[PDB]
Design a protein around this ligand. Structure first.
Ligand code: HEM
Ligand SMILES: C[C@@H]1O[C@@H](O)[C@@H](O)[C@H](O)[C@@H]1O
Ligand SMILES: [Ca+2]
Ligand SMILES: [Cl-]
Ligand SMILES: [Cl-]
Ligand SMILES: [Cl-]
Ligand code: NA
Length: 302
């Protein structure tokens, strides 16, 4: 389903090359910056959960935006993803005129392309989002974004507000099949005692990277295939090798465990659900019609 105001053909007349421009850029950029794909995918999710899929977190004045200096490491996002959205927007501006394609639409398109260039399934992206001029505050971030220490009941409660369900939860967490995570996001599972749900061999390996509390290092989210979009994330879970509590508790909790097992056994079933759930996620509290603006410069208010 597609929310009121969005359409697949939104730029057919105004910028018909838009999706090819975004895709070509992401394909080129990840050759140099393999982690950009993870950065762009997470930036789309992060934005969506902080007030709605409205590019609010791209603004220089926004908490966790590109100028963020106060936030903890796991709320300090990969710098190259912010810049890639801007560069893409610039190329769309040259080809189709400025302020035609919204930054929110670029976020959704770039996430899709990042999934594909990493080996994942393509899917059609509904378009027509408008951009919000509102700066995100710290309270917006804390109110919208569950921490990695969250367990399944709390995660489902957050998702149910915006009409995502357990299957969406398990499929969308598969975004952690690529990318990086800071020691601080899982060090509670290592200090002062090991979490019993950590695979003991895996825990030993983590302690190599994070030998003490407060280690300023990152490791891979997916110990099996760090940069390939695939179902290995769920294979990790079945072997107690999820990095975050919010990862591993999907396998612990009865509400989610059989979905994890299904996606561990069948990458095809994971891919088929992930595309559906991504389309749902990219429509959370979107602005459409005359709401919001088409931002000319993704980092700044018009
Ligand atoms: C809602 C539950 C979620 C939680 C609690 C969560 C938590 C986290 C944490 C703690 C990090 C690492 C930050 C750091 O330590 O530097 C991370 C990274 C990441 N997340 Fe999630 N996340 C969630 C959902 C998602 C979703 C739905 C997606 C995409 C569909 C996603 C995609 C990513 C990616 C790609 C990264 C790696 C970013 C990079 O390497 O630059 N996450 N997430
Ligand atoms: C990083 C900033 O972006 C561009 C210019 O409009 C500014 O002068 C500055 O260089
Ligand atoms: Ca992987
Ligand atoms: Cl250009
Ligand atoms: Cl630190
Ligand atoms: Cl497949
Ligand atoms: Na937002």
């Amino acid at each position: 389903p597609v929310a009121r105001g969005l359409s697949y053909d939104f730029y057919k007349r105004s910028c018909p090359r838009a999706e090819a421009i975004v895709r070509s850029f992401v394909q080129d950029a990840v050759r140099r910056d393999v982690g950009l794909a993870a950065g762009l995918l997470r930036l789309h999710f992060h934005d969506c959960f902080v007030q709605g899929c409205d590019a609010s977190v791209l603004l220089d004045g926004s908490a966790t935006g590109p100028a963020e200096k106060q936030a903890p490491p796991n709320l300090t996002l990969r710098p190259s993803a912010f810049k890639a959205i801007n560069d893409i927007h610039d190329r769309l501006t040259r080809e189709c005129g400025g302020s035609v394609v919204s930054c929110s639409d670029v976020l959704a398109l770039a996430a899709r392309d990042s999934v594909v260039v990493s080996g994942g399934p393509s899917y059609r992206v509904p378009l027509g989002r408008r951009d919000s001029p509102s700066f995100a505050t710290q309270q917006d971030v804390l109110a919208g974004l569950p921490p990695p220490t969250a367990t399944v009941p709390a995660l489902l409660a957050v998702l149910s507000k915006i009409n995502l369900d357990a299957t969406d939860l398990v499929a969308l967490s598969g975004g952690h099949t690529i990318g990086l995570g800071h020691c601080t996001s899982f060090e509670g599972r290592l200090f002062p005692r090991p979490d019993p749900t950590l695979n003991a061999t895996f825990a030993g390996r983590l302690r190599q990277t994070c030998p003490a509390k407060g280690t300023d290092r990152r490791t891979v989210l997916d110990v099996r295939t760090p940069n390939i979009f695939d179902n290995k994330y769920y294979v990790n879970l079945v072997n107690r090798e999820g990095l975050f509590t919010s990862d591993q508790d999907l396998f612990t909790n009865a509400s989610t465990r059989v979905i994890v097992s299904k996606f561990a056994r069948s990458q095809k079933s994971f891919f088929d659900q992930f595309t559906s759930s991504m389309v749902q996620m990219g429509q959370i509290k979107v602005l459409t019609g005359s709401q919001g603006q088409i931002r000319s410069n993704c980092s700044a208010r018009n």
